[PDB]
């Protein structure tokens, strides 16, 4: 996997180059804003199970066919499985945010997922809706002005939404 640094480093290496001082300045900038990154990781994590449970509940109300007997989330093995996936996707999104690079999320979570769902009969579009709701709730928790040093987190919010969107796209 890559973090924001080693992503740049690996690209440099295949060119046999040292980083341009422009590149280094970009990284310096990312460093200077890292407190905000870490806050976002802590906040999302600190609400993982309400993020997950709420989105799940909400999804089910919108899509009752999912939990009607016969639906993919009917029976406890399956509901459990379904909740577990929500948590997993959220886990890997937080990883990518912390590392500052989508690779962990791409490689270990999303890659091959669309095919896994197809084979199982799980409706991807539905998962994506789930992911769509977690993303909203997450961002709202990130952006909450209470209890934090006031500043602009909007670039970060934009990045975090990016990672959620990838997850949703990867199962759609």
């Amino acid at each position: 996997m890559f973090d924001a640094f080693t992503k740049v480093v690996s690209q440099a290496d295949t060119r046999g180059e040292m980083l341009s001082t422009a590149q280094i300045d970009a990284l310096s900038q990312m460093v200077a804003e890292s407190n905000k990154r870490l806050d976002v990781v802590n906040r999302i994590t600190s609400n993982a199970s309400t993020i997950v449970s709420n989105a799940a509940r909400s999804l089910f109300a919108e899509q009752p066919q999912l939990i009607a007997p016969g639906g993919n989330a009917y029976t406890s093995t399956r509901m459990a499985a379904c909740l577990r996936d929500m948590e997993i996707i959220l886990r890997y999104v937080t990883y990518a945010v912390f590392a500052g690079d989508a690779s962990v999320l791409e490689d270990r979570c999303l890659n091959g997922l669309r095919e896994t769902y197809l084979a199982l009969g799980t409706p991807g579009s539905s998962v994506a809706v789930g992911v769509g709701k977690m993303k909203e709730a997450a961002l709202a928790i990130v952006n909450d002005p209470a209890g934090i040093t006031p500043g602009d987190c909007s670039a970060l919010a934009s990045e975090i939404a990016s990672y959620f969107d990838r997850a949703c796209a990867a199962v759609s």
Binding site: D3, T6, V9, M18
Partner: protein, 162 residues
């Protein structure tokens, strides 16, 4: 790879755990170190050419036979002199990479793994490279935390070759 950020994630992932305070403290470590580290990579990059010749020269000085034995593993011709400077360059470049990433990772992956097979195979002497690295330490002219971290990578290469 071995870097603070990717290792943090790896342990967490292998444990099936969301990140916690511990991993956030790792990142803090990395981000505060990064100020020095990045500045150090910059300074080393701007002295690239001078450090590389200087080192090469240092090696040829300690080990003069290398500039005069016949044979492809030595620097008695231009070809060999170029190779040698090429390799020293590689070492320096990795050291910058390590400073940027904040860990041995880049060096481990791009340079260290399999080095023993190369030197054995092509009859290159680790001693020669050790001198190059010693020279780079004496001459990079960094100070403070930038020097300390840079030297840790140069000594790391040295340990790997001895």
């Amino acid at each position: 790879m071995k870097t603070p950020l990717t290792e943090a994630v790896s342990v967490a992932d292998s444990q099936g755990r969301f990140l916690s305070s511990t991993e956030i403290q790792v990142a803090f470590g990395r981000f505060r170190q990064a100020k020095a580290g990045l500045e150090a990579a910059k300074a080393l990059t701007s002295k690239a050419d001078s450090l590389i010749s200087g080192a090469a020269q240092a090696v040829y000085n300690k080990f003069p036979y290398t500039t005069q034995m016949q044979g492809p593993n030595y620097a008695a011709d231009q070809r060999g002199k170029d190779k040698c400077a090429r390799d020293i360059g590689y070492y320096l470049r990795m050291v910058t990479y390590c400073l940027i990433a904040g860990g041995t990772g880049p060096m481990d992956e791009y340079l260290i793994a399999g080095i023993d097979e190369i030197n054995r195979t092509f009859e290159l002497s680790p001693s020669w490279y050790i001198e190059a690295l010693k020279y780079i330490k004496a001459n990079h002219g960094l100070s403070g935390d930038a020097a300390v971290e840079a030297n840790s990578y140069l000594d790391y290469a040295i340990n790997a070759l001895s």
